[model samples]
Target: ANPSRLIVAIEIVEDEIPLTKVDGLKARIILIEDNTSEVGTQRVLPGTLVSDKDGSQSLVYPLFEAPVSFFGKLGDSNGMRVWSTTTADIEEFDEAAMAKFKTRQFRIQLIEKPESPVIVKTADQQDYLNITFDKGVYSDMYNADLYVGDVLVDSYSDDGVVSGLSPLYSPFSQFYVYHENIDLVRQMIYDTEMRVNPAAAAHTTAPGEIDFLTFLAVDGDPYQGIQVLGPLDGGITLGKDGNIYASGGTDG
Candidate 1:
């Protein structure tokens, strides 16, 4: 198992995955050991899925450039920082494959390997829930890094971003990016809402008051994104006039 296993809706740790939502969300895991898949699709968030099967399998091939990180003579500081450069390049590689004349050798390098594919509460597995959406919802749980990918956002809190806001679906939507893929916009939306784990904030009620929005802007696409509003402000309920009346404030 990869130290960081991706692919599954709800990625599992040591135990079997928790089948919370994606219980019956049937899909297959197409592993590209060589190049056993189409050109464009891959295993990123909100993936289009290379092929549609029921379970996991491996497809081996010979693509010297299959895993680009292994390409063009890797370096020190750069390679140290990136296993395969930024995800942006990942997207680029995905796009390029579409125009090339792929072969069995080409096919060998890109296979969809599913790690513990069963994404639900299984006998060997515990409870689980997964979503096929990751526009902006970042999770600062494990890899403490800013992101525009599935879960794993935030530089502080161990469980920074949870299920976050997806980008505005259309030009009709508030956070619409000019001339951008709506799907890509949606991903940044998911990431922009990751939790703030900064170790400083002793006195503000409005989470919006903090640099939360600033952080969102940092991790999100300025072109198209939304605000998580912010951490739950205790129980400040809606008043008779639909205004939020909070405690500790002067009563009417």
Candidate 2:
């Protein structure tokens, strides 16, 4: 509970731990306590008797050396940070254990945790949807599930990168991310074509423009480059007979 004494992962140390393995397991013993210390924060002592539980449950013999920080904390709770006056000899200790401890401890300290995946609905016909999922390092990639409202769109097939979908318009339609491991993952909502304010003006008829593509003015520029209509799915195609055709489906 509190920073009382050393707590080993294994009870039987000397019986099971050989002299060859003591160097490796020493790090594990150093990590007997977590970083959230009730006692004033302190560094691990070099000559500290970091042993196991007690007589029967006692694990390792004991190590005395300048070990590295285990959980991004300065050290253990027994001592304070001090510059060693002796030569730097970590070989007397365990580096792999420190690395393992760091990995196990720091893996979840995410600067960017997995948030609600955002669906980037773009005007590029070839590129329909880009559902980008930003996540923390501890996030299990396989647990991610993508959904369009109630419909299950897909699962963790890609690295939060989804593209190539004709945008369908629905007032109730939205995309979100779900994960079995994380409850904080939120849902990313999308507005349907008609109600989508950003793309709404492009769908209206203009004075001089005839079609939806040529009518909408972006910053007062008409007939601009690669102008598409509402819902991104709204696109005009030229027929084989040199006639323009509108392909508005149930997507809206």
Candidate 3:
């Protein structure tokens, strides 16, 4: 019993009477792990629904692994951070849970390398976007859900990366890569710029119209693939041959 064993327990109490507003309220516990098999952890939802009739309880073993100096040593047990949402006295926490909310996670590495690809290409050719685990610990034996916004889009496998060509219209889409087999999940937003064949008149600058100019930068270099930028709150107008021009210039 010297070595720490991860145990999770939840409780909800209702007196012999006056349970107050139980109101179908529930409790959950999320246990995060690192320095193990992956950069992830495990958790339980609506954990052991606290009973209003009396005191309710639930229990679980947090993981398939363990770490001593894990979340930064603290006495006999390293401080294990827990995030929980309420009922009675309330709870405190550190990190936010992804299953409960959406967080931004993308690797659009360009300029120096495509280690993290920022892909905006033609459909049905060179199709499928990519997502790779930095360590490639992702396994082929299992799979998980891929989400675009609130909709379930596809299946992501342990192959360490996901790719597809079915494009989502710009304004950049959010892609959620989940490794449910082991409860490992990650999210990313693709900052995309799609280019369709442009007609001359479309970009022609007439007086009173606003045309904003921007560039697709790589590694912060700021000067490579020159193309008309899209959907900006505001910016200076660029004309044909790409130059900042005053009123009545070609729209770029």
Candidate 4:
């Protein structure tokens, strides 16, 4: 099955920053070439900004093709590249620490509105998937089913509602589904791989496993948060309050 494409939704705080200044703002994803070495040629993935209603903006781009994992950093036209900036103050990753721990990062920036954006599949424009969640689904824990175009793929039933079943939880403060059937859904929706897993062990011919997907609810706030739905080996640590640690290290 081909991978799916990832979309980045950034909330534009126009109150402090004017619309003119925000107009020239652009975003890019930076992937380091070598993990063991501190210095190497990095790949800069670029995308076009699609304006949305209110102060919300989105960037639809191809996911990284490589199996090897590295901290996913974002660079902006402002000349300041960031790996961790979800808090009131901007915090970044340490080069020496990243090299020592071999941590790969994937941080979801701040967003606005809970509506699921339309996912246009390049393979077949006529065939696309619309993912929507029940109202207040992320706020309170309740019984809710997530569907992929009328087909119920996964559901969230709280403890008493469905005993022995884990509640639908996500660090992104949004909906999350880790079912293996998602790979099948990806096959039907995407023309290329949408999400990449950590690389396999050396000397092994096996490919990295597929990662999970999460839907983030944006509120047009300046302070954003990070979420994780995949392996922890990538070095993303979440606090008790669900805030991503500024440093990629385990200790917060």
Candidate 5:
């Protein structure tokens, strides 16, 4: 019920290619900290990308298939402490990494002699699965009429602006792979659909309110836009074409 009881943790995998060095592969991890799961959480990216010089940077990029704790550990209880292990190659590291990295979980570990993992929980674990899809508002489309001649043609407009003007400024939204651009949106629809079986599937959902919306108030005439949005589902809702088939407690 309260966000005060949240902790951010990180885990990494070394998909090291042959002869490749770790020098340039800076690591970045991120997590969300915000209003709800139905609406996209603010980017709370975090990660463990240590260098030979021993410095770290923000963690982002490199998609994945694992569950992480957005906010769990609170109060340290025992207070914070140092943890790590002796160095080794990818094979040994991957095999014995935190005892449960194989499951692709963020295993908070006791990084000393034995190099084992210790679990951290907030009352329960199964509850984690249920605490998903907090909703928010998002726009997916904008249609504009344009043509080589003076005549207007129904067409898609560019979302490259990314930022909508104030009063029209969207909240906590990320640019989409497919947006106001029809070509990109079509390709996005194809690429996303091809990934999994069934052209039309129920895995699609976009939850959230249209927190903000506005268009060019040109001559009191509005630009036509075929707005679109992926189910905010807070972040877990994955669907083709960014189509959100689900709605939250509130809808715009």
Candidate 6:
């Protein structure tokens, strides 16, 4: 049978703060459809919080299944909304009881390996390391622990930024023995072991390395398959090649 889209609405309580104002607030709508068996098929849809100018708020979701049961969550906590019905029609989620739900602040960081480790020769050719913390004020101090393999190499308390050692080089190749984060350390170690070793050898023998190379080979354009449902923000746009690009964000 051809599939169709279903629209679900959730009503927010009056006098509650807008969801956008709440940092890291997340809500999801779960749909459970009764199929041929006793155990039904389920699908989870992300909710989009909408605030109206008249001081009203709602969470909207577009789903594909006409479910027998509906479940919703106000936050990552235990506050929940559940409903069961014999028919496909479902009731709107009224978040009156969720007024007292506790919310916690979180910080997100993006870490990436901008350059391959094998390409390092001079100091300028070394890997560019960027660790960014989300902009906000915290009530308490933030600590960071740097681990290499299973060993705790370094630790920082009450300090948001920490520097690391420089790259050590052999006769022909360079190796980064110490770094700020595990991602870069692991990446440098892998590159040193695979690419910087003997010539004409199997560089992609490791299963993880082989899988990564396979992905880059098969998926020529990494961002080609992404779909943007609606118009993006002015700072973000879908390029002609179907990749999402963002600009005008604060440089970390």
What is candidate 5's lDDT per residue for 119-139, written digit by digit as tens? 222122211111001112111
| Cα lDDT of model 3 by residue, 82-174, tens digit | 111111223221112221222211111101112232333312222232222122222222232212222211221122234453433321112
lDDT of 3: 0.22
TM-scores of all predicted structures: 0.16, 0.13, 0.20, 0.18, 0.19, 0.15
- Candidate 6 lDDT by residue in tens digits, 134-207: 11222212222111111111111112223245433222111121112222322332443343332312322322
User: What overall lDDT goes with each candidate model?
Assistant: 0.19, 0.21, 0.22, 0.22, 0.20, 0.20
Return the candidate ranking by TM-score, descending. 3, 5, 4, 1, 6, 2
RMSD of each: 24.9, 31.5, 24.7, 21.5, 23.1, 25.8
Residue-wise C-alpha lDDT for candidate 1, range 19-83, written one tens digit per residue: 32112111221222222233223343333322123343322111111112111111100100011
Model 2 off-target regions past 4 Å? 1-41, 46-106, 109-252
Question: lDDT (0-100) at residue 151 of candidate 6?
Answer: 13
RMSD of 4: 21.5
Off by over 4 Å in 3: 9-22, 26-50, 53-65, 69-77, 82-252
Q: lDDT score of model 1?
A: 0.19
Candidate 4: which pairs clash?
2-192, 3-192, 3-193, 3-194, 4-193, 4-194, 71-105, 111-218, 112-218, 113-218
Clashing pairs in 3: 128-164, 128-165, 129-164, 203-251, 205-251
Ranking by lDDT: 3, 4, 2, 6, 5, 1
Runs in model 4 with CA error above 4 Å? 1-61, 64-97, 102-106, 109-166, 169-252
**Higher-lDDT candidate of 4 and 6:** 4
